[PDB]
Ligand binder design. Structure first.
Ligand SMILES: CC(=O)N[C@@H]1[C@@H](O)[C@@H](O)[C@@H](CO)O[C@H]1O
Ligand SMILES: *[C@@H]1O[C@H](CO)[C@@H](O)[C@H](O)[C@H]1NC(C)=O
Ligand SMILES: *[C@@H]1O[C@H](CO)[C@@H](O)[C@H](O)[C@H]1NC(C)=O
Ligand SMILES: *[C@@H]1O[C@H](CO)[C@@H](O)[C@H](O)[C@H]1NC(C)=O
Ligand SMILES: [Ca+2]
Ligand SMILES: [Ca+2]
Lengths: 83, 149, 83
């Protein structure tokens, strides 16, 4: 949406079940989003028309909650592993 | 294949070389050769996710990369690094403790910032005031403090 | 077979006990999740669980195949190899 709520759109609508946390990469203008049922970390573009998987089909993720970014590194927290 | 490699470059775009099967064809660094085994094509390096960190422009057999003003490009041609001298500071929320970690050349230092926090859930920071904001679920409140507690 | 190269195919395997390989896939069973898992033996590219949570801790796994195995002559089959 617009930061005043005047425009609203849905950008990720499929292959999504319990989307927990969001983070933004400003140089690339990318949105980073994380899912706790399908257990993935993905990044897409502001319109949701380019989409990619960072961690997927990996047992490292149990119940992710929150996400942050720095340089070429992504940090997250997991409630199942307490990690 | 074609012995006429010698006569007409084998119809190949860049270069043909003689061999036991008549023709062999090669494209230089950054290029790619395809199903016809004769033409040359350019690797669109920017199509690889994360080839270079921030901005990428494809060129014939080459690439160009750029970083935003907060960042300086490194000598290799792909990596970007941060100009600010301050260490990375990483803040995590546990119910009784706002944990803070300080990063120095891939070494860690972990401590607990603020006293008397009940159940912290959400965190953010403001760079103008140099402050950290958090919310407490048992208190039903939002608090702000300095990065030194 | 000599140790010349070493690689990690699956980076997290929740206390695997038993292991087998067939086709493009590697299968293993673990105690922690009480499950049998399938992965791709070159990359861990596609990871799935072949079973639901089983009622008890699973155990070792093996394969049944109709095709005849690799065959070779046995030195022991002539006069017990002298033994
Ligand atoms: C003008 C320019 O930077 N050219 C680059 C060169 O530096 C090198 O990186 C090469 C790698 O294939 O790509 C091209
Ligand atoms: C080259 O062959 C592969 C395999 O058949 C095919 O996937 C690809 O589309 C072909 N490319 C061209 C340019 O013909
Ligand atoms: C982080 O560590 C550096 C190096 O010891 C120090 O100068 C700086 O004050 C520390 N910052 C915080 C917020 O702990
Ligand atoms: C904490 O940081 C603020 C802002 O830089 C500063 O004004 C204050 O003196 C600091 N206090 C301590 C005890 O370091
Ligand atoms: Ca999960
Ligand atoms: Ca190129």
């Amino acid at each position: 949406a617009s930061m005043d709520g005047t425009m609203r759109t849905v950008i990720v609508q499929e292959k999504i079940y319990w989307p927990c946390g969001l983070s933004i990469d400003y140089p690339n203008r990318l949105i980073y989003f994380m899912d706790a049922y399908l257990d993935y970390i993905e990044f897409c573009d502001y319109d949701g028309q380019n989409r990619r998987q960072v961690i997927a089909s990996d047992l490292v993720l149990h119940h992710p909650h929150a996400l942050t970014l720095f340089e070429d590194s992504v940090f997250w927290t997991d409630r199942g592993t307490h990690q | 294949n074609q012995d006429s490699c010698l006569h007409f470059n084998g119809g190949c775009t860049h270069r043909c070389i003689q061999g036991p099967f008549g023709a062999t064809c090669v494209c230089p660094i950054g290029y790619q050769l395809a199903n016809d085994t004769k033409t040359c094509e350019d690797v669109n390096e920017c199509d690889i996710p994360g080839f270079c960190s921030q901005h990428c422009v494809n060129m014939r057999g080459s690439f160009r990369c750029a970083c935003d003003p907060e960042y300086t490009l490194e000598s290799d041609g792909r990596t970007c690094k941060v100009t600010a001298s301050e260490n990375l500071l990483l803040v995590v929320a546990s119910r009784d403790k706002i944990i803070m970690d300080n990063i120095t050349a891939h070494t860690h230092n972990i401590y607990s910032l603020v006293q008397d926090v009940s159940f912290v859930v959400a965190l953010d920071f403001d760079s103008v005031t140099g402050r950290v904001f958090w919310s407490d679920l048992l208190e039903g409140k939002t608090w702000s403090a300095f990065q030194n507690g | 077979l000599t140790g010349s190269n070493r690689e990690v195919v699956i980076s997290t395997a929740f206390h695997s006990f038993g292991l087998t390989v067939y086709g493009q896939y590697i299968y293993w069973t673990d105690f922690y999740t009480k499950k049998i898992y399938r992965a791709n033996k070159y990359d861990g590219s596609d990871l799935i669980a072949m079973t639901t949570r089983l009622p008890t801790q699973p155990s070792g796994i093996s394969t049944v195949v109709k095709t005849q195995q690799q065959q070779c002559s046995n030195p022991c089959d002539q006069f017990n190899g002298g033994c």
